[PDB]
């Protein structure tokens, strides 16, 4: 029973960062899809730092290789300033380390550290710390959050679910029960009929790569933003005093690290406790339906001053590609985009290792043989019937922790190497029983063929009047 | 619950049909017909007998381009790209039918009783009385004073079409034609487009009214809304977009009205309608034309008191945001990806009744009335 207009208020997401569109936006790069292409063996992209990026080197212009979807867009657009999803650490967390810096340290302690009379080193160290606290801390937090192999497994499986490809599709087909419909939020695991997730098949060619690339990007943004919001809403102002004391105690060491990536390595460690990360990772990544992603996509578009009905428009198109092609600010966004592309090509979305090794019926003989006998089960001895629902539950629950290479793109069944673990069926374990069931099924079928019609045999004698060889 | 999601129970029925070949897109010169001037009156009802016949084909005067949906010249580039990309064979129009309960009772009492499945205890017994038409041949001949079977069949089909389409249209005439409702519709359009009077009200109060939203009179005071983007665009595209905005708003209004109706029924009302139908059967069966019977049925099931109680608080305030969300969900369900360049639902609607198939005359009237309010309000 609901008596209210469909829209609701959600303070979790309402935050945006306004900055000028890059000269090197996606739409302004015709061959961007060429570089973005990934092949077998590609390794997960890593964050970058100002140490290896000296200076940023860089509204829409009709390029020579502008593809159809981008060609009409590059034309009908009043592009002045495109807003971006506000991807940031909680405002208080930030307050803690900006008020601590404010230059409070001064130059005397810096000179003590450098052990040299050159002020250039002092200025360089100050700039390193400022850049670290501005961009490299966040990049490190992202790197740790999304790089957990278990967390990457979870992301891969939720993407599998949302785009209905591979093992989830097989389960839906065999089950006769629709499994895509499950939509979740912080583990609540609701169910919605009013949800479309199979409309992405209507697109192909470069129209698909891009579109999916987008959908995955917004999904990652939604994940991170909800994570940050839930963390913020569970802040303790006592933990704030503890953070203040810890920063006071550690600043002496923190101002004495040579690398910038190292500087950020320790700041994240001190500020981002492992227990909190694990608690957030408990059940946070939640199933998202394509419809919700499109609704969020429209939110971003409208709030940013572009009518959703001025033909095609995707937020992922207004963002740079490489780190040295983007202003420091949006470096988190660049990292997110590279991560999204890596996941998209990893998941085969254009199976990853979640389908080919074991869950694939074609590759796994035992699983196929078990499936063939799904319905022809029977045992009364006064149900014991292997129902579709039970086998599908067993198939879905199973996942082999090994043989799932989370470091690079391997795509088993393309390598000429054996599997890490032997393939086994989901419910049935002993192969002898499976052989017996196969034998009884074959005898059943052959008998039915031999006497399906019934046979007429002579009344006086006993020969068959219509024998079939 | 997920924030950017939706699950209601009274705004999603989505009658499905094949796109009429004579739909709005396929008429390139539709813009000229859509033109209206000072000497224009509200669109009028049309009955099945009133129109001689229906023709669905593209017809003459339309020439296929040299390249369901056929590419044509003399049309907005939006239509060109739309036709080049999408050529679906079905669309999920919003449902505007009367509630299933009232329609089922009307049909059972008047046309024919619904035949439930035969439970297996006997067979070959021709107990036609259960499945017999409500009025037999002899009674119809008596009332019609003629043995001509052609007249009996034509009258039967006439009121079958009547109870299937016109009664639905009749209610609508009444419900949207009221001058007071007309004033309220103008006011809500001004509020949602922030034009003139609303702009000066915001200036005087120093508070933008874009955050004013209502639903059955229980205002939610939503703040995430912006209704100033439409001013950027101009031309036939602006007219098309506004004409749509208003058509969808009217569809939502009728849908919520028909939901509040469906909520408030009881078996007492069921028996009341049954008694009224059985006692008046003759005066409905014998009528001069489809307008008379439609009006009589409307009075039977649409008393002025009921209309009155519905109209109050019906035209709830709505945002451009809410509108787009509806449009999005319409196209999503139809099977059409929102990422497609410039797809709107009003394209799949014939302009006027002469070409529409019977079931979609309600949508045709919605679109025509939408155009009339759009032009009269001076959308500029």
UniProtKB/Swiss-Prot annotation, chain A:
Keywords: Chaperone, Eukaryotic host gene expression shutoff by virus, Eukaryotic host translation shutoff by virus, Host cytoplasm, Host gene expression shutoff by virus, Host-virus interaction, Inhibition of eukaryotic host translation factors by virus, Late protein, Methylation, Phosphoprotein, RNA-binding, Translational shunt, Transport. The modification Phosphotyrosine is found at residues 161, 456. Its main location: host cell. It is found in: Host cytoplasm. GO terms for biological process: intracellular transport of viral protein in host cell; symbiont-mediated suppression of host gene expression; symbiont-mediated suppression of host translation initiation; viral translational shunt. Induction: Expressed in the late phase of the viral replicative cycle. Residues 97-141 are annotated as: Binding to host EIF4G. Residues 144-262 form the RRM domain. One of its GO terms (cellular component) is host cell cytoplasm. GO terms for molecular function: RNA binding. Might be cleaved by the viral protease. Phosphorylated. Tyrosine phosphorylation enhances preferential binding to tripartite leader mRNAs and allows ribosome shunting. All late proteins expressed from the major late promoter are produced by alternative splicing and alternative polyadenylation of the same gene giving rise to non-overlapping ORFs. A leader sequence is present in the N-terminus of all these mRNAs and is recognized by the viral shutoff protein to provide expression although conventional translation via ribosome scanning from the cap has been shut off in the host cell. Protein that inhibits host translation while promoting late viral translation by ribosome shunting. Blocks host cap-dependent translation by binding to eIF4G, displacing MKNK1 from cap initiation complexes and preventing EIF4E phosphorylation. Binds to the tripartite leader sequence of viral late mRNAs and recruits host eIF4G, PABPC1/poly-A binding protein and 40S ribosomes subunits on viral mRNAs, allowing ribosome shunting and efficient translation of late viral mRNAs even though conventional translation via ribosome scanning from the cap has been shut off in the host cell. Belongs to the adenoviridae shutoff protein family. Monomer. Interacts with hexon protein; this interaction allows chaperoning and trimerization of hexon proteins. Interacts (via N-terminus) with host initiation factor EIF4G (via C-terminus). Interacts (via RRM domain) with viral mRNAs that contain the tripartite leader; this interaction allows ribosome shunting and expression of viral late mRNAs. This is Shutoff protein. It comes from Human adenovirus C serotype 2 (HAdV-2). The lineage of its organism: Viruses, Varidnaviria, Bamfordvirae, Preplasmiviricota, Tectiliviricetes. The gene is L4.
